[PDB]
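Blinded run. Sample ID left blank on purpose so nobody reads anything into the name before looking at the predicted structure. Input follows.
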Amino acid sequence: MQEEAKLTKANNRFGLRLLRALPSGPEKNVFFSPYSVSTAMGMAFAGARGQTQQELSQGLGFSDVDLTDAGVLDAYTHHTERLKSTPSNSTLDVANAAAIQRTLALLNSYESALQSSFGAELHKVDFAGEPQAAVDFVNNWVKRKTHDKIEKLFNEPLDPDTLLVLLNAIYFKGEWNTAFVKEHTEKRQFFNGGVTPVEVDTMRLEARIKYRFFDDLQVEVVELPYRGLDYTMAILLPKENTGVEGLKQNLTIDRFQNYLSDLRERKITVLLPKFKLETKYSLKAPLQSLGIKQIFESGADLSGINDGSLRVSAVEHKAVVEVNEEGTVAAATTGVVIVPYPEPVVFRVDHPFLFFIRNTRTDDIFFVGQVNKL
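Blinded prediction complete.
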């Protein structure tokens, strides 16, 4: 398979692995862009060497798909290019950049790689002398690229020893192929945390929708496509009200793709809450739990960046989504901070569930959520 296809496979596997490691609870929703996180970590990977590079190759999923270090940069070039030129009814914008200390010398090779593989602009800032101005700059980049959906990634200035912040932003807007019928939206029961009944605005449609119940993990699956059917929201609904955490833990990328392959269009009724999520994560700890460790530590080898001693102090992520009768808008951003050292069917989404906004042509998974509380 193509390098870009290997990369999609690595990104997707990493995506579910990260999903499993994110903080979750009956009162705490989960939402993030694994594609955003992977892309930002790819930019750091471009500058990693030695054991640090090998550990990242492993962690980001490259090794398991036989995607070589050089192949990663190739694959990213093709992702970046196809993202620009792809004809769709839906909007998907991905942007990358690097905020660099004004007096930091980057290796020419790294600067070139950021441009060629990621289309990443460089922007000089004064991390050391002007922490407020530097973080204002970074946040205003995030705001423009997420189409104003995320105002700030960093709520406080960065530590003045910061030398580089690698940034990714993503924005998605789609309209449903089959809109929910707004006249039929009503307050309906939803089991918050799988156990606490509340009333929430709940949307209704009845149409031929890709659907299957799978006995293996006792899960109903649908895909709700956007216009043109090239993007979809896949929804995984546990049989049991309290089934979501177990579902998340049991899911693998092969099982997920196999579920998708087995869906068939069927006339069903879908009852789906309208909802908005807004989340934020410090990803260092979850990334460490996935075995990505050396990059965070003294002794890290990021010498492909500036031929010096650099490590990652933090990886921060923010994400937002709005789901309603017309469609979906989602955005996310990631910042890597671097320092020196047939019978009727009713698909009733009335309890916690997982969803995935994906491209059906490429298999790219752009957004993933777990809805626990509404």
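Unblinding after everyone has recorded impressions. The CA atoms of residues 52 and 294 lie 6 Å apart.
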